[PDB]
């Protein structure tokens, strides 16, 4: 699906982003609700791995933008 | 579908079914100095043709390629089927491939805005593909119809021998005229007295003589022949070819027929009455009409051409003296609100202290008459 | 504003008028060429010529009837060689009257040796042929008795 | 040749060569009350088209079948070659099959002379057959020219507005006339002053007035316009 | 279709749908004095209606036979399908068996022109054939009004 | 009767001679139409039987027959 121009991008841009891990512990999923929710409804496995464009899927950076400007604010 | 590949396409006309997968290759032509991505989405049959967002295009199994790619992008065009195989139908909906620009093309360097990334698409079946049942060969019939690119004002009129001068519609005129000249079908079927040559239009040829019923030889009796000199026989049209298909009083000029250089010529003018009136002789259909020497010279074989009209009325003459006669049908029908397109020219009408132009219409210019009779 | 139509001719000569008062003018070229022994097929009609104590028919010829003029301008056919072989035939009786060459430049030739206007029946249909190179030799006409015995 | 089979034929337009053998089947339709034989001879390429005697037809590898045969007669059409394979040429001469009547058809019974033995020929390539090189697709251009079936005496004259009356040739007239009307090429190119409508022929339109050079206004001055 | 066999046809009125192949047998056996051949070709559903020439018929899987052949020719009518099975509507297009005269028929001998070859066609379903859904047998009304033959 | 569409196609025929005189439309609402352009009462033989047809939509085009003149050529 994803084909980054690595092959022909020369080496002018960085491929992977080198960054320190998130200062945050992992959080549990469904395991919590299992006992008190009336039902635990599973979803189509095909959705489980497809990275699809979110409804808040676009944003733009321009030289008019000034640091601090919010490009997008996603709420879980 | 087989239509994607000319070879397969040609073959489809020999078998009545098919199943299989094709392989698609997209190839882009770009420098290392460009940027921008494209996205190809595989759309299943039974979806719809509604427009999408690049974001939405991502929701389908897809491939996003960067413009700089050198190697061809291969994408499998899979035969997602609801049935066992396909029978040649338009009802059959197949797998689709939609390609959209994902990120804007940004060329660097001394940016020549004439610069564009060209793309080419190629396919080929895979070993899965197979045609199904052997059915007769190919071939069919045709073809089509065209019209000649001649403007109306460069055309010849089909009911009075003059150029076409006017192009109009006019709801207050008779809507379903029973014109005998200038009639042909698109298929080439000539109707009525319609001649091929516009020089024949509103003209006749005859053997001419002066009988003596009254006994005062002012009346020419014309035994009609066809204008190419052949014999006229009452048949399956109203009169000899091109004979006038309207009424009133026609002034004709009658000249000795021209057969060879040196044929001495006589030329007389007559008035002939085209309409029904009245106790009452004249039957072009039977081959016999009378004109009178506008006394109000010529005989043997003659040719008569129209000089002016007096009291024109655009209704058909009485061709067969009261009896039924063969006629092209009234023009029509028309849907509600539809009216006849008229090609128009002008006859000289006389008076009698005053000659003035008088309009006469026809359904196609003679060039279109000839065109259809010839193309069949 | 007026329209002028021809009524008769006096002293006809079938040469072109002086269109541009002495100066060169744009002209379709002379009809031709023809192979040796080939002559132009003429479609003919008669003008009223006047006199002046005497009107008499006068012949005037042209290379194709107007219907064929309109036919070609309308079809815009693709031409594939230098002329078309045509047969003139009586479709009623079936009789072939002659063969002829319709050159692509729009004029028809027959091979005929006579001297000698030769006239044909006007009833009278033309059929294509072939394409036909320009040096195609036609069967002649006029001619006269061609049978021949072993003797 | 591929031309024998419409499928193959259609395919030949995609490849530039071929080699192989076809299989031929002749099928006759007759009663048990008939008689007569047919002979099929295999003629090699590079022979000639000269006519033969039934006796001579025998000199070639042949098959003689009796009209009463029910089963189809199969004869192998072999690709006798001088070269490795065939390139689409008319220079390529191939194996030929000539069929002739060997013995006269004699029908018995209440002999209905309307009776005839019908024959049908069918072919099909054999696994030996193969096309050679993949070359562009098919297609071309055209087409042709026809004339309208209108007799001359039903036609309109192109230089004087009258019917056509005469059709002739006349070697004593000017042989190369410079006619400006009635000129068109077969391709549709109109020449000269040639109009489309025969009502335009030998006619003009103008604005008309009476100037006074002499000063005795008998002369109309016509400033010409086109007739439309 | 079931309409090719009298028994099946009767059962058809009771079921909605079917799938399967048929076994067809055409019978000929003219005098030893007659000569002539016929051609039977199978036409795939989806081809449509077209007037076929004898030569066109050859393009389809075919069989040719001499009118004198004693033993009946057996031809399997295969159920070429695009879908899983059939229903009893007009939306269905099945395979066809067209039989045409291949060569002119001509009797020899003391030709009694009253002589024509009388052919017979017989069929029976292949064991693959099956009817599908049980349905209210019937539904073939046809109330066609008429006028009395009285002159004005 | 049960009616199944908008009109019935009928032929008027001479059953004696066999001759078909015309075709016509019997509309379900109980009146008969012919296509005829004349102006012009046109009269028919009264001996004279009608036969159904078809059903027939209401826009069914009848044969006018009648102009018994085919007036033209061809060849």
CSV table of C-alpha atoms in Angstrom, one decimal, chain E residues 15-131:
chain,number,residue,atom,x,y,z
E,15,UNK,CA,-41.7,-26.1,-9.2
E,16,UNK,CA,-39.9,-22.7,-9.5
E,17,UNK,CA,-36.5,-23.2,-11.0
E,18,UNK,CA,-34.2,-25.9,-12.3
E,19,UNK,CA,-30.6,-26.8,-13.3
E,20,UNK,CA,-29.2,-29.6,-15.3
E,21,UNK,CA,-28.4,-31.1,-18.7
E,22,UNK,CA,-30.7,-32.8,-21.3
E,23,UNK,CA,-30.0,-35.7,-23.6
E,24,UNK,CA,-31.4,-35.1,-27.1
E,25,UNK,CA,-31.9,-37.7,-29.7
E,26,UNK,CA,-32.9,-36.8,-33.2
E,27,UNK,CA,-34.2,-39.6,-35.4
E,28,UNK,CA,-33.8,-39.9,-39.2
E,29,UNK,CA,-33.9,-42.9,-41.5
E,30,UNK,CA,-34.8,-42.0,-45.0
E,31,UNK,CA,-34.9,-44.3,-48.0
E,32,UNK,CA,-31.6,-45.7,-49.2
E,33,UNK,CA,-32.6,-43.5,-52.2
E,34,UNK,CA,-32.5,-40.2,-50.4
E,35,UNK,CA,-29.4,-38.1,-49.9
E,36,UNK,CA,-28.8,-35.1,-47.7
E,37,UNK,CA,-27.2,-33.9,-44.5
E,38,UNK,CA,-28.3,-31.7,-41.6
E,39,UNK,CA,-26.3,-29.8,-39.0
E,40,UNK,CA,-27.0,-29.3,-35.4
E,41,UNK,CA,-25.2,-26.6,-33.5
E,42,UNK,CA,-25.2,-25.6,-29.9
E,43,UNK,CA,-25.5,-21.8,-29.3
E,44,UNK,CA,-24.4,-20.3,-26.0
E,45,UNK,CA,-26.8,-18.2,-24.0
E,46,UNK,CA,-25.8,-14.6,-24.4
E,47,UNK,CA,-25.3,-14.7,-28.2
E,48,UNK,CA,-28.7,-13.5,-29.0
E,49,UNK,CA,-30.9,-13.9,-32.1
E,50,UNK,CA,-29.2,-13.7,-35.4
E,51,UNK,CA,-30.0,-15.3,-38.7
E,52,UNK,CA,-27.2,-17.9,-39.1
E,53,UNK,CA,-25.9,-19.0,-42.5
E,54,UNK,CA,-25.0,-22.7,-42.8
E,55,UNK,CA,-21.3,-21.6,-42.7
E,56,UNK,CA,-21.9,-19.7,-39.5
E,57,UNK,CA,-23.4,-22.8,-37.9
E,58,UNK,CA,-20.0,-24.4,-38.3
E,59,UNK,CA,-18.4,-21.9,-36.0
E,60,UNK,CA,-20.4,-23.3,-33.1
E,61,UNK,CA,-19.8,-26.8,-31.6
E,62,UNK,CA,-21.7,-28.9,-34.1
E,63,UNK,CA,-22.6,-32.3,-35.4
E,64,UNK,CA,-23.5,-33.2,-39.0
E,65,UNK,CA,-25.4,-36.3,-40.0
E,66,UNK,CA,-26.7,-38.0,-43.2
E,67,UNK,CA,-30.5,-38.3,-43.3
E,68,UNK,CA,-30.3,-42.0,-43.9
E,69,UNK,CA,-28.5,-42.8,-40.6
E,70,UNK,CA,-30.5,-45.6,-38.8
E,71,UNK,CA,-29.5,-45.0,-35.2
E,72,UNK,CA,-30.7,-41.8,-33.7
E,73,UNK,CA,-28.1,-39.1,-33.1
E,74,UNK,CA,-27.6,-38.2,-29.5
E,75,UNK,CA,-26.5,-34.7,-28.6
E,76,UNK,CA,-26.1,-33.5,-25.0
E,77,UNK,CA,-27.7,-30.1,-24.4
E,78,UNK,CA,-25.3,-28.7,-21.8
E,79,UNK,CA,-26.6,-26.2,-19.2
E,80,UNK,CA,-24.1,-23.4,-19.7
E,81,UNK,CA,-24.7,-21.0,-16.8
E,82,UNK,CA,-23.5,-17.7,-15.6
E,83,UNK,CA,-25.4,-18.2,-12.3
E,84,UNK,CA,-26.0,-21.1,-9.9
E,85,UNK,CA,-29.3,-22.1,-11.3
E,86,UNK,CA,-32.5,-21.1,-13.1
E,87,UNK,CA,-35.8,-19.6,-12.2
E,88,UNK,CA,-39.0,-19.7,-14.2
E,89,UNK,CA,-39.0,-16.2,-15.7
E,90,UNK,CA,-38.2,-14.4,-19.0
E,91,UNK,CA,-34.9,-13.1,-17.5
E,92,UNK,CA,-33.4,-16.5,-18.3
E,93,UNK,CA,-31.4,-17.3,-21.4
E,94,UNK,CA,-30.5,-20.9,-21.8
E,95,UNK,CA,-28.4,-22.8,-24.4
E,96,UNK,CA,-30.0,-23.7,-27.7
E,97,UNK,CA,-29.8,-26.5,-30.2
E,98,UNK,CA,-30.5,-25.3,-33.7
E,99,UNK,CA,-30.9,-27.8,-36.4
E,100,UNK,CA,-30.8,-26.7,-40.0
E,101,UNK,CA,-30.6,-28.4,-43.4
E,102,UNK,CA,-27.0,-28.6,-44.4
E,103,UNK,CA,-27.3,-29.9,-48.0
E,104,UNK,CA,-30.4,-30.0,-50.2
E,105,UNK,CA,-32.6,-33.1,-49.8
E,106,UNK,CA,-32.9,-35.1,-53.0
E,107,UNK,CA,-34.6,-38.4,-53.5
E,108,UNK,CA,-33.3,-40.7,-56.2
E,109,UNK,CA,-35.1,-43.6,-57.6
E,110,UNK,CA,-38.7,-43.3,-58.8
E,111,UNK,CA,-39.0,-40.0,-57.0
E,112,UNK,CA,-42.4,-39.8,-55.3
E,113,UNK,CA,-42.4,-36.1,-54.5
E,114,UNK,CA,-44.8,-36.9,-51.8
E,115,UNK,CA,-41.6,-38.1,-50.2
E,116,UNK,CA,-40.3,-36.0,-47.4
E,117,UNK,CA,-38.2,-37.2,-44.5
E,118,UNK,CA,-40.2,-37.4,-41.2
E,119,UNK,CA,-37.9,-36.6,-38.3
E,120,UNK,CA,-38.5,-37.1,-34.7
E,121,UNK,CA,-36.9,-35.5,-31.6
E,122,UNK,CA,-36.8,-37.3,-28.3
E,123,UNK,CA,-35.4,-36.2,-25.0
E,124,UNK,CA,-34.8,-37.4,-21.4
E,125,UNK,CA,-33.1,-35.5,-18.6
E,126,UNK,CA,-29.5,-36.3,-17.6
E,127,UNK,CA,-29.3,-37.4,-13.9
E,128,UNK,CA,-27.7,-34.0,-13.2
E,129,UNK,CA,-31.1,-32.4,-13.9
E,130,UNK,CA,-33.2,-31.3,-10.9
E,131,UNK,CA,-36.1,-29.1,-10.2
